[PDB]
Structures are given as C-alpha cells and as structure tokens.
Coordinates of C-alpha atoms in Angstrom, one line a residue:
X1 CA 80.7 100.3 148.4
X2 CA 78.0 102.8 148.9
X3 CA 76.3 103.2 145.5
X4 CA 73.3 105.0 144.4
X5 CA 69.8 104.3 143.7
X6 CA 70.5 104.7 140.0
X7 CA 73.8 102.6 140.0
X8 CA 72.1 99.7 142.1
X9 CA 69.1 99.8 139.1
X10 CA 71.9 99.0 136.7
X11 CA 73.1 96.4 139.1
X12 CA 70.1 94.1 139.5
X13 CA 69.3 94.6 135.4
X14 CA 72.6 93.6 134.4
X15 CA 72.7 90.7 137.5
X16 CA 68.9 89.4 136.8
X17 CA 70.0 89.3 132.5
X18 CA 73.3 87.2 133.5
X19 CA 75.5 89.6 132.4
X20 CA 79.1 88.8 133.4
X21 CA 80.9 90.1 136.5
X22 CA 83.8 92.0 134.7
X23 CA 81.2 93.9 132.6
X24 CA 79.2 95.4 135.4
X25 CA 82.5 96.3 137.4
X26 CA 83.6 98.2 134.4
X27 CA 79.9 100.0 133.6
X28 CA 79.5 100.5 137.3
X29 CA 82.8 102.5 137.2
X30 CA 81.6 104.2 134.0
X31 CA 78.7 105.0 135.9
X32 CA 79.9 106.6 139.0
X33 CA 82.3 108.4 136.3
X34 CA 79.3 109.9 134.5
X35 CA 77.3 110.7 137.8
X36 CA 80.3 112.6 139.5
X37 CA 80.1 115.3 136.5
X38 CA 83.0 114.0 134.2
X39 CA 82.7 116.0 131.2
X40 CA 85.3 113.8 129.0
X41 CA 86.6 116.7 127.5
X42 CA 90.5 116.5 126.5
X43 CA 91.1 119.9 125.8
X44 CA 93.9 121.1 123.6
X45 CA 95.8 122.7 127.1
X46 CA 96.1 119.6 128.2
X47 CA 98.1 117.5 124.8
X48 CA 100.8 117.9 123.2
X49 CA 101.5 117.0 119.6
X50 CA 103.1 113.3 118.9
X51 CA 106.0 115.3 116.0
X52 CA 107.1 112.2 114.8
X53 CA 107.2 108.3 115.2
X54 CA 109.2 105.5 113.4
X55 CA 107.4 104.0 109.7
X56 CA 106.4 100.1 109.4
X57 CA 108.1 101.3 105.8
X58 CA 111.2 101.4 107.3
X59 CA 111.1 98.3 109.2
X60 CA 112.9 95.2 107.2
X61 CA 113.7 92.4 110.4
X62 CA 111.0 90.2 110.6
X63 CA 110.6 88.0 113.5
X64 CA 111.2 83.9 114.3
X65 CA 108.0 81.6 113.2
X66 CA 108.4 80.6 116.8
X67 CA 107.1 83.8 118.1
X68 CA 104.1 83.3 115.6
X69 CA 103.5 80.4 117.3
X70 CA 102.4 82.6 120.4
X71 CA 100.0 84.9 118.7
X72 CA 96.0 85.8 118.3
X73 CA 94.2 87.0 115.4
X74 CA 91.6 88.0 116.4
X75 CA 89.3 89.8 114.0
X76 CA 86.3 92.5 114.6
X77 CA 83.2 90.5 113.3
X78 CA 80.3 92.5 115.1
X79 CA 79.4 95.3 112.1
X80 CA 76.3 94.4 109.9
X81 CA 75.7 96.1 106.9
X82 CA 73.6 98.5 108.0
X83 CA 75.8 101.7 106.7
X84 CA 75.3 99.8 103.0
X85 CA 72.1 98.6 103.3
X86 CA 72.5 94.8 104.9
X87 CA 70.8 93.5 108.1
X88 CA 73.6 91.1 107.5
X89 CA 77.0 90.7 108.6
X90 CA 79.3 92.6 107.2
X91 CA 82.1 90.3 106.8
X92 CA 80.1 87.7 104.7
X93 CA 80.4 89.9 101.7
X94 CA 82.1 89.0 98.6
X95 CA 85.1 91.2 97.7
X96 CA 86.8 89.0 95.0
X97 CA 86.7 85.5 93.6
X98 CA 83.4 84.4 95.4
X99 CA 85.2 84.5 98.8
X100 CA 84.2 87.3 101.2
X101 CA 86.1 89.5 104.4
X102 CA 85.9 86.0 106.2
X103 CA 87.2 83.6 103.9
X104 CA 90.9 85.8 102.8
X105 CA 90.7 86.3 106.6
X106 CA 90.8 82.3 107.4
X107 CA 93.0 81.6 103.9
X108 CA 95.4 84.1 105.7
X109 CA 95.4 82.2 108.6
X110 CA 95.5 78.7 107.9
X111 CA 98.4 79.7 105.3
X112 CA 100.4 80.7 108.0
X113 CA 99.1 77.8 109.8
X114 CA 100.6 75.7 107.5
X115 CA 103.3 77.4 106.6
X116 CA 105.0 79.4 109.1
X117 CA 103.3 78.3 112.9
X118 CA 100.2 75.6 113.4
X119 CA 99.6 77.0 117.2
X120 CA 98.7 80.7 115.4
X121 CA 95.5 81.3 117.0
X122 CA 92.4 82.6 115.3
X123 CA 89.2 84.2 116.8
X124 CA 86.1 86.1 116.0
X125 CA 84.7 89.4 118.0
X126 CA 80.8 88.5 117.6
X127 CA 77.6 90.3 118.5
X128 CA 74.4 88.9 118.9
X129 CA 73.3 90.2 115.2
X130 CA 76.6 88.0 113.7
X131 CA 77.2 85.2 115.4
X132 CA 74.8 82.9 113.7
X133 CA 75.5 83.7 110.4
X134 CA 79.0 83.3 110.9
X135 CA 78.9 80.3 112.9
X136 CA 77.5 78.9 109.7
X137 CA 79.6 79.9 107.6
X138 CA 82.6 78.3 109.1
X139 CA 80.5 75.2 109.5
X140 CA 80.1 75.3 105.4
X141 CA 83.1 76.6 104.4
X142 CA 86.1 75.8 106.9
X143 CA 85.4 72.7 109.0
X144 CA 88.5 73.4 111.2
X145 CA 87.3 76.6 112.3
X146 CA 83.8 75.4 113.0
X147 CA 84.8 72.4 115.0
X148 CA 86.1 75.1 117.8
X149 CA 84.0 78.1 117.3
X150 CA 82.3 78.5 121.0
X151 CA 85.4 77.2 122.9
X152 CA 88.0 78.9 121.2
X153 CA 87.6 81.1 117.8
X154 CA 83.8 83.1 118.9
X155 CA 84.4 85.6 122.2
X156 CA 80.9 87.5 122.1
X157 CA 80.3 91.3 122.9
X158 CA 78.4 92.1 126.0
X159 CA 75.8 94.7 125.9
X160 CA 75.3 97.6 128.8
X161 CA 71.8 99.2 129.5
X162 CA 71.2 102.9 128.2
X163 CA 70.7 104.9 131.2
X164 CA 68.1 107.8 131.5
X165 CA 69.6 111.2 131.4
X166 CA 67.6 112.5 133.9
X167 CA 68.1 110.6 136.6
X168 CA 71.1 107.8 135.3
X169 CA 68.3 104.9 136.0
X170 CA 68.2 102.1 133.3
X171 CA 66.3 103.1 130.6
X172 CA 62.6 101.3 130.0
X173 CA 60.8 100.7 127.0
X174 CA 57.7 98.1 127.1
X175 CA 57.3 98.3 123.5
X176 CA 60.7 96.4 122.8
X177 CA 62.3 95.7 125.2
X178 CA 65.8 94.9 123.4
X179 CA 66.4 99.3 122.6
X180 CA 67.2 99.1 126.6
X181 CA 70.5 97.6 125.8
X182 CA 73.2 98.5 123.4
X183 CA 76.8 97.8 122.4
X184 CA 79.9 99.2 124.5
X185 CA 81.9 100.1 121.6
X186 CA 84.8 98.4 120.2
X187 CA 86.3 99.2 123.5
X188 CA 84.3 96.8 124.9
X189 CA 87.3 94.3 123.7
X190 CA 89.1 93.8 126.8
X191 CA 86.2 93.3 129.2
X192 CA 85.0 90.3 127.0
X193 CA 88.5 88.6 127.0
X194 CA 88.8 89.1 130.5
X195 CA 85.2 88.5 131.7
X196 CA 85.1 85.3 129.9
X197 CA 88.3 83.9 131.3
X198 CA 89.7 83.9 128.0
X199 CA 92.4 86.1 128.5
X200 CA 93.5 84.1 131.4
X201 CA 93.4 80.6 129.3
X202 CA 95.3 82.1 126.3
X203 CA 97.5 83.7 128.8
X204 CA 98.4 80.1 130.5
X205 CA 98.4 78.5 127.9
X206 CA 102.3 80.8 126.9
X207 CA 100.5 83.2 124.4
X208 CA 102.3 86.2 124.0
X209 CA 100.8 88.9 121.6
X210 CA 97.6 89.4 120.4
X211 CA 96.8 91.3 116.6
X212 CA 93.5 92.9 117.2
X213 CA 92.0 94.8 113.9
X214 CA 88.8 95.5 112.3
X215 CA 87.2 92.5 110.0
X216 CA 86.2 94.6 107.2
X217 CA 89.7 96.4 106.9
X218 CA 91.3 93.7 104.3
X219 CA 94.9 95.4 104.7
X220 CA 95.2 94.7 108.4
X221 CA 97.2 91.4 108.3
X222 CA 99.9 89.4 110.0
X223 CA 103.5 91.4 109.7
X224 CA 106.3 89.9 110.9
X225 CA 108.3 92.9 111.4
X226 CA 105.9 94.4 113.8
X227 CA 106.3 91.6 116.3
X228 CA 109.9 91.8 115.5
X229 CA 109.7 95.5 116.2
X230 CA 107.7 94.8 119.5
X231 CA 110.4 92.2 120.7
X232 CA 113.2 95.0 120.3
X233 CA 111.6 98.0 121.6
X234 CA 110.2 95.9 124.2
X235 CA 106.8 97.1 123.7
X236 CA 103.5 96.1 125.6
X237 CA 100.8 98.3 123.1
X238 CA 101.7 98.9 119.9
X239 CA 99.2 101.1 117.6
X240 CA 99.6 101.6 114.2
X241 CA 98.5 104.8 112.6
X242 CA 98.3 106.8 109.5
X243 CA 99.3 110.3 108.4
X244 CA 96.0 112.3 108.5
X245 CA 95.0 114.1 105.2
X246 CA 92.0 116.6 105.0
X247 CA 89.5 114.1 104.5
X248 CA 90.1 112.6 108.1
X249 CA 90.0 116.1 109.6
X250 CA 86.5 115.1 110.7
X251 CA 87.5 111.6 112.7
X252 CA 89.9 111.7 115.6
X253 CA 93.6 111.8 115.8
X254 CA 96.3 110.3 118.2
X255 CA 98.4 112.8 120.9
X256 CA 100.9 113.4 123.8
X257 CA 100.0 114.0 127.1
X258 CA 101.9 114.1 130.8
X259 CA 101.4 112.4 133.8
X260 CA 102.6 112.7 137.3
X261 CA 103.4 109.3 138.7
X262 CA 105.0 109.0 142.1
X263 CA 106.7 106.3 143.4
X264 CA 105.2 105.6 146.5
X265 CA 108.0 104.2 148.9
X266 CA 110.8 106.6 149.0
X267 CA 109.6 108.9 146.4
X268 CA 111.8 109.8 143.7
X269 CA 110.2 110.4 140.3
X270 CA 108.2 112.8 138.4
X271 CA 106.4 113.4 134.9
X272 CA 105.8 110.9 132.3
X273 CA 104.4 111.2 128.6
X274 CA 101.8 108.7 127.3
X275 CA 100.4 108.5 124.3
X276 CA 96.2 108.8 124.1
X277 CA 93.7 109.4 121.3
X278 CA 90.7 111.8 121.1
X279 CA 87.7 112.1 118.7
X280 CA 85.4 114.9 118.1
X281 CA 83.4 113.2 121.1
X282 CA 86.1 114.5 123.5
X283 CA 86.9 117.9 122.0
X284 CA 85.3 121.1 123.1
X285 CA 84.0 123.5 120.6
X286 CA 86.4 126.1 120.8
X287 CA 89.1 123.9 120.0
X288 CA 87.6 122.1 117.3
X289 CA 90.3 124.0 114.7
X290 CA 92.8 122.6 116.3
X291 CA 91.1 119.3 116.2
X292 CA 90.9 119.9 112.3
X293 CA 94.6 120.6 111.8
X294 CA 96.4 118.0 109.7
X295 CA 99.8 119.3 110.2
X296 CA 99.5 119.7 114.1
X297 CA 97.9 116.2 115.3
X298 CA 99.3 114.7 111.7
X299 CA 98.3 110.8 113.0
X300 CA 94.6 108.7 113.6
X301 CA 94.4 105.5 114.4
X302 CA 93.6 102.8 111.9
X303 CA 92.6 100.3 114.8
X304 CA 95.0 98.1 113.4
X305 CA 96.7 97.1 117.5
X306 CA 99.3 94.7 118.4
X307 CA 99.0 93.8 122.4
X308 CA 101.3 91.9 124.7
X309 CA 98.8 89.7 126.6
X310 CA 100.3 89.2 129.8
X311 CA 101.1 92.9 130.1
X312 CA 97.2 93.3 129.5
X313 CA 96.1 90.8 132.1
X314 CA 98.9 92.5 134.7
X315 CA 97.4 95.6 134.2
X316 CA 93.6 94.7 134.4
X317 CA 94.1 92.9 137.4
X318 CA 96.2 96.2 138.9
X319 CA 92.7 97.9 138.4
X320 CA 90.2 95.8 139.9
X321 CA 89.6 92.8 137.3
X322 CA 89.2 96.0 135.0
X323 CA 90.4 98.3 132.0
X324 CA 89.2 101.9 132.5
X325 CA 88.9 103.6 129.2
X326 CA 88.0 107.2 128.5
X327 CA 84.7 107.7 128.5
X328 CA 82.0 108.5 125.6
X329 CA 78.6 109.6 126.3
X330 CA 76.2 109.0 123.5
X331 CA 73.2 111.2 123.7
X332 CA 70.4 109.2 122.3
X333 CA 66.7 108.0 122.6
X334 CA 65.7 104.6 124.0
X335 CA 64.2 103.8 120.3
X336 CA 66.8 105.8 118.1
X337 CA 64.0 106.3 115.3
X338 CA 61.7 108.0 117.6
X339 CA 61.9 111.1 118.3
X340 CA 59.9 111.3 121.3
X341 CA 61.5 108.4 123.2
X342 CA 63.2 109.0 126.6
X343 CA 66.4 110.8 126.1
X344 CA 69.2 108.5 127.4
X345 CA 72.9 107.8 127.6
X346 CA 75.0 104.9 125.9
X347 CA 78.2 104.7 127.1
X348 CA 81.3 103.4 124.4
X349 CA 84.9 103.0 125.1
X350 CA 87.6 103.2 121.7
X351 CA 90.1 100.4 122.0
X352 CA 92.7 102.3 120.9
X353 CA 91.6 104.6 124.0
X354 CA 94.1 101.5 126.1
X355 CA 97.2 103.1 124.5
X356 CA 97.1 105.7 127.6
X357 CA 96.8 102.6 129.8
X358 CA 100.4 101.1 129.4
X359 CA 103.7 102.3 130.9
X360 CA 105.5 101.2 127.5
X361 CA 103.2 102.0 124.7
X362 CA 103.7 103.0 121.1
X363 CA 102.9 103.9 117.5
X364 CA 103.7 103.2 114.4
X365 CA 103.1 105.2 111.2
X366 CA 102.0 103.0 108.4
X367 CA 101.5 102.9 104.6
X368 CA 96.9 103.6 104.0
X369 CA 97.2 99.8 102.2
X370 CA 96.9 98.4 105.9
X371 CA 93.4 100.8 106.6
X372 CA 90.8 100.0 103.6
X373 CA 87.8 99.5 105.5
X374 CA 85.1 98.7 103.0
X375 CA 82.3 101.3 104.7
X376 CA 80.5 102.2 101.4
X377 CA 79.4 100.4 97.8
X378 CA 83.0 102.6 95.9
X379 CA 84.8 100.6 98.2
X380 CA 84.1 96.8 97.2
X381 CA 83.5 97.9 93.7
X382 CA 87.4 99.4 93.9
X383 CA 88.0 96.3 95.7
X384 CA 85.9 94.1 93.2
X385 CA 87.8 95.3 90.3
X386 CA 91.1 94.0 89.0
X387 CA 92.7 97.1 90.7
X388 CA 93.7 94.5 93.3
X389 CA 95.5 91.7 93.1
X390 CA 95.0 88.2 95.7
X391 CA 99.3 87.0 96.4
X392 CA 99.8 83.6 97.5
X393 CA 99.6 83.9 100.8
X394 CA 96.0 85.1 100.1
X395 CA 96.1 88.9 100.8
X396 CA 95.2 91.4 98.7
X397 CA 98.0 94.1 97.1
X398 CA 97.5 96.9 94.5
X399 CA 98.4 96.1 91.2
X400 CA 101.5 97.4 90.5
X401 CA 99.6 99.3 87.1
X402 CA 98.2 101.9 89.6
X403 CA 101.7 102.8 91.3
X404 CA 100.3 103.0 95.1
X405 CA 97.4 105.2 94.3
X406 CA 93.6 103.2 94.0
X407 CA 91.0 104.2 91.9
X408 CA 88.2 106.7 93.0
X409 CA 84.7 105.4 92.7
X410 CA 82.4 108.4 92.6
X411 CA 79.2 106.5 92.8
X412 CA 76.0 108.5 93.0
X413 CA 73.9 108.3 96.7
X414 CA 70.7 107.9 94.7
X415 CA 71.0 104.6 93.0
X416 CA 73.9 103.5 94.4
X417 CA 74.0 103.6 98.6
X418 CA 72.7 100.3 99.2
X419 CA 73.8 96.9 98.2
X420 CA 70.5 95.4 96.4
X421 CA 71.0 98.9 93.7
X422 CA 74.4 97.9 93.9
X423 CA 74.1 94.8 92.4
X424 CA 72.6 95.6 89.4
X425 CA 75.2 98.8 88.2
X426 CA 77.3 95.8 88.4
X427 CA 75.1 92.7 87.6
X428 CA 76.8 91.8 84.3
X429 CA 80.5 92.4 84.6
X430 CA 83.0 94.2 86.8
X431 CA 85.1 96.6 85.0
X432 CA 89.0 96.7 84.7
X433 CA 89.9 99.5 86.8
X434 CA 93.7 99.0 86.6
X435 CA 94.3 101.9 84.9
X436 CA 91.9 104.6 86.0
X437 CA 92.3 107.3 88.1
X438 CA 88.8 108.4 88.5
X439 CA 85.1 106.7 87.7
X440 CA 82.0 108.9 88.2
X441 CA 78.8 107.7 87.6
X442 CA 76.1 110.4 88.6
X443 CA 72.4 108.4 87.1
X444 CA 71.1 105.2 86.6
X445 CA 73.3 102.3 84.8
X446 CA 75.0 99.5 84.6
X447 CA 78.2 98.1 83.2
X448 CA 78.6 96.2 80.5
X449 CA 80.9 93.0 80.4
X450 CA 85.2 93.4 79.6
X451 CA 84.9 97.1 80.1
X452 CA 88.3 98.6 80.6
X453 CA 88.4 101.9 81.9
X454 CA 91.5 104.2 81.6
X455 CA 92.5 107.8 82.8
X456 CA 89.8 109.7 84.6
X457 CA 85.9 108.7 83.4
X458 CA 82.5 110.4 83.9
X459 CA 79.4 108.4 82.9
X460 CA 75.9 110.5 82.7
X461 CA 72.5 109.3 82.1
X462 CA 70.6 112.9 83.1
X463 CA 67.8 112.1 81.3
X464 CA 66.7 108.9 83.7
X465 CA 64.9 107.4 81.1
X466 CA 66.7 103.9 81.6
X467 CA 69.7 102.0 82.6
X468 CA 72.0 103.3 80.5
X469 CA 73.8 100.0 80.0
X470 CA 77.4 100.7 79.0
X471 CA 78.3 98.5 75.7
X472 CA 79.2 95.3 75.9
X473 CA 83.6 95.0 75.0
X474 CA 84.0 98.9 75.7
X475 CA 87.4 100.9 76.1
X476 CA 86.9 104.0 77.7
X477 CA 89.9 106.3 78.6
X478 CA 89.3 110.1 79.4
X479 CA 85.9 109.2 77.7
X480 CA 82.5 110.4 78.6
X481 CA 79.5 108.5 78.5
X482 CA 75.8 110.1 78.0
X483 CA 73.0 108.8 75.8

C-alpha cells in the first residue's frame, strides 16, 4: 500500500513510540477513513427502529458452573475522577463498608471463584493514569490478584496521535509533549486484546465468553441466565440495553439497519438486518428530533456486553488482524484548555459500535439496577446510604423499603460537584435514605449523625452564613430544613 504523506507521519510516530502492530493497522484504516471524506453520519433514511426485543426479566434458566468455568470479567478500569473532582482512579472510591468499585468487583469474583467455577477469569482495562494505583491496590488488598496482574488480570489501553485538521499530519506540541496523544475510546477494547496476543492465549486456552462492562457501573455483574440465554440462541454479541426515558434523550440509542451480502460463489442471497448504535456524534442536525424520540428508538446501550471469544478472534482475523468500528471525529485542540492551540482530530470508536460487526448479534432489554454508573457526588451518596443493601454474594441490591425506585439526590453544583466538598456535607454521618423519595440540598451543610430521612425533603441554608449542620438524631419526613 500506497499511503500518504500524512498517514506515513502517523506511521513512523506510532512505530518510533513502540506502539503495537494491531493499533496502527486499525488508526491507519481510521485514517484513510477520515482522509477519503467519510462524514460518519447515520442518518435516520438509513435505520429502522429495533420495536421490540426479549427482557433479562423474563429470563429464569440459568446456565452449568461449567460454562463459568470459560468466562472473562473483564472490568473498565481506565476513568479517573476527573468528572467529580479526582486526578485519581475512579474505581478506588469507597461506595459502602470501606470497600470501593474494586473491592465488590474482586469479592464478586473470587465468590464465584469459590463457589461456582475457580478457572472464572478476571481482568482490568487500564490506562496509563490507573494502572499504578491499581496495581497497588491489589498488591494491599487481594494478594491473588496482584500475584498475576501484568500477565494475566492488567491489559492496558493504547493511545493514537491527534492529527492536525488541516492537513491529517500528527499533531505537535513542544510545550508537552504528552497532549499529542490521546485515548481511542472504549472501543479501543478489542485492538488491545488482540494486539497483545491476549485474545489469542485466552482463546487457546478453551475460553469461551467474555463479560465486558464499565468498572464504575456496580449493577453490571455475572448473570447466569445471560450465558444460558447465549448458549440457546446461539449468540456471538449479546448487548444489553435499557428502555430510554426523557432524561437519556440527549445520549445515543441502539437501531436496525440492512445490509446487502452476497454470497460470492454461486450467488444466492440478499438483505440482512443488523443491529448498530448511534450517538449524537453520528446524527445530522435535521434529524436530531428523531434522535430525541423515546418512543421511536425506545433502547441505549448500558455497555454492559457479553462476547463469544472465538467468534471475536474469527472475525478480526477476517478483516486484517482488525475490528473496524464506526468512526468518531473529535474536534479538539492539541492542549484542550487552550484555546489557541492547533485544532486537531481524535479519533474514538464505542464498543458497543461491534454489535454491527457480527452475523448473529443481539440485545437484551434489562431492568436500570444493571446501569448505575456513579458519574456525579448524588450518586455514591445514594449509593453510600442504606438505600442499598450488599447480598452474600457481595453485590449490591435495593432495599426492598424503596420498592424498585432509588432515591433522588438533588445536590447543589456549588458546594457539592467535587469530592473534597463532598466529604464534608457528609463528614459526620451518612443519612438513612431508605425511605425517601427526594433529598435537596440547595446551600452549604452538612449532616448530622443517625439522620433518617422520609418522604420527599428540601434542606436550605440561603443565608450562607455557615454549615447549617443538621441535628445530631434527626427524623425528617416531608420536613423542611432552614435556619
């Protein structure tokens, strides 16, 4: 192949940094995908509505321990704090009982290691930003897990360059050099576990299915009767996805489209329908109504996916060593604080985007419990309070005192958006929020200690003067709180 100037500049960067093979195959592609004036638009004209799909909720076989044995956690470790306030990783937060994302994650595991299948296999998608961090934490916390952390639980991220939207060169920037790279997206997952050989090793070694899902979503565990459900319908991607309500009319949402495949000695078939995903990234603007419909595209996609590894490996190796995924230009700066920094390019992939890749491919609609990713300081307080409950088998339910619906933290932007603000509105206890519907808290304070708080609650501090510290041994229900 005959590439241009630009593409061959991304060539040498990525081969002089020691950037693996299977990365700059896929980029490259990207690449010669942006060059060739791909818009990535998937217009409305071109989908059809998914109308309905079958519920985990209706599921009730579960599957043989022995298929267990042939199964991958693996768990998305690369997010730090940064939406919360924490150059930290976000998985190394506490969420209940002094343990954090990382310790129910590993409880989960090594209680179906013990219980149900010891060859279950665990592993961690890291960045750069995480990996230390974490690979303490398992060395402190769960010996077993550090013991095989770089040759079998960490697979790291790669990084592509940001190319110039000029002239699709890589990107320079003396000043720091590390803004001249940046992440892939979550997509990225399938070029790491290929690039590294890792897909081929788990692969020999007889694994069958792989549960990929998001470190910081606490609902995304193990369910037998997925796999079970796999194993009947024969599936190679399963996705599972949640009815959209008007507050996810902003992210994407899962849809049908058709495909002519031909068979190519002999010739006799025609049009197939495979299921895809767009966000906002890939809808024009005069469809972006129909984008916001919750009653035509009713699903999104929790990122909550089940994959059949040898079917993955087939089909990467069908395409050139290779997953091509949709994809998402990111118009940016080289330095994303400044302003006047040379406009660039990143290029990101969704894996849930791979849905579209496989000839038997499906989803599955499934109860909000399995998507509570804790993205804001409400969450882990709702999550902090007894409102949730740890089983057994260490995951965490909703008490059965809220009858499915979770309470609403309402916490104000101004004292309350980052974590080390956080901590003190909750320094002193966490209250009971078993039985609430609704907590608003629009000023400064902080809780008391045994607070219980019932019905729907507003607490006010307008005049700013100080923490309005809530009495100690308080009982509010449909009670309002001002000095």
């Amino acid at each position: 192949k005959s590439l241009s100037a630009a593409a061959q500049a991304c060539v040498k960067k990525m081969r002089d940094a020691k950037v693996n093979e299977a990365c700059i195959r896929t980029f490259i592609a990207q690449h010669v995908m942006v060059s060739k004036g791909e818009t990535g638009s998937i217009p409305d004209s071109a989908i059809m509505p998914v109308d309905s799909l079958d519920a985990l909720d209706s599921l009730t076989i579960e599957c043989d321990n022995a298929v267990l044995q042939s199964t991958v956690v693996l768990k998305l470790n690369g997010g730090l704090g940064t939406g919360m306030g924490l150059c930290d990783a976000k998985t190394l937060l506490e969420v209940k009982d002094g343990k954090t994302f990382l310790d129910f994650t590993a409880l989960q595991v090594q209680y179906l290691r013990q219980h149900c299948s010891e060859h279950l296999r665990f592993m961690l998608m890291d960045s750069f930003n995480t990996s230390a961090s974490t690979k303490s934490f398992l060395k402190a916390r769960y010996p077993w897990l550090y013991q095989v952390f770089d040759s079998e639980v960490e697979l790291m991220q790669n990084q592509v360059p940001k190319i110039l939207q000029d002239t699709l060169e890589p990107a320079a920037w003396a000043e720091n050099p590390a803004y001249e790279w940046a992440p892939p997206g979550h997509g990225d997952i399938y070029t790491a576990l290929y690039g590294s050989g890792k897909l081929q090793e788990l692969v020999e070694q007889g694994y069958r299915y792989m549960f990929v899902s998001n470190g910081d979503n606490l609902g995304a565990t193990i369910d037998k009767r997925v796999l079970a459900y796999m194993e009947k319908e024969k599936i190679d991607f399963l996705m599972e996805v949640c009815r959209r309500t008007e507050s996810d009319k902003k992210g994407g949402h899962l849809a049908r489209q058709t495909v002519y495949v031909k068979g190519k000695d002999g010739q006799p078939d025609a049009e197939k329908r495979v299921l895809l995903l767009r966000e906002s990234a890939q809808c024009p603007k005069a469809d972006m109504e129909s984008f916001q419909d919750i009653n035509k595209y009713s699903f999104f996609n929790t990122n909550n996916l089940w994959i059949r590894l040898p079917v993955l490996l087939e089909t990467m190796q069908e395409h050139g060593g290779t997953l091509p995924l949709p994809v998402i230009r990111n118009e940016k700066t080289v330095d994303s604080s400044n302003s006047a920094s040379p406009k660039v390019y990143q290029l990101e992939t969704a894996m849930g985007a791979a849905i579209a890749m496989f000839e038997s491919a499906s989803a599955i609609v499934v109860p909000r419990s399995r998507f509570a990713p804790v993205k804001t300081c409400a969450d882990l307080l709702a999550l902090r309070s007894d409102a949730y409950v740890v089983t057994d088998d260490f995951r965490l339910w909703l008490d059965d005192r809220c009858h499915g619906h979770p309470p609403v933290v309402d916490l104000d932007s101004a004292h309350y958006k980052m974590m080390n603000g956080f901590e003190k509105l909750v320094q002193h206890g966490v209250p009971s929020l078993v039985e609430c519907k609704r907590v608003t808290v629009k000023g400064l304070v902080q809780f008391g200690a045994g607070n219980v708080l019932t019905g729907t609650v507003t607490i006010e501090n307008t005049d700013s003067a100080s923490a309005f510290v809530i009495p100690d041994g308080a009982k509010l229900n449909d009670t309002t709180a001002s000095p």
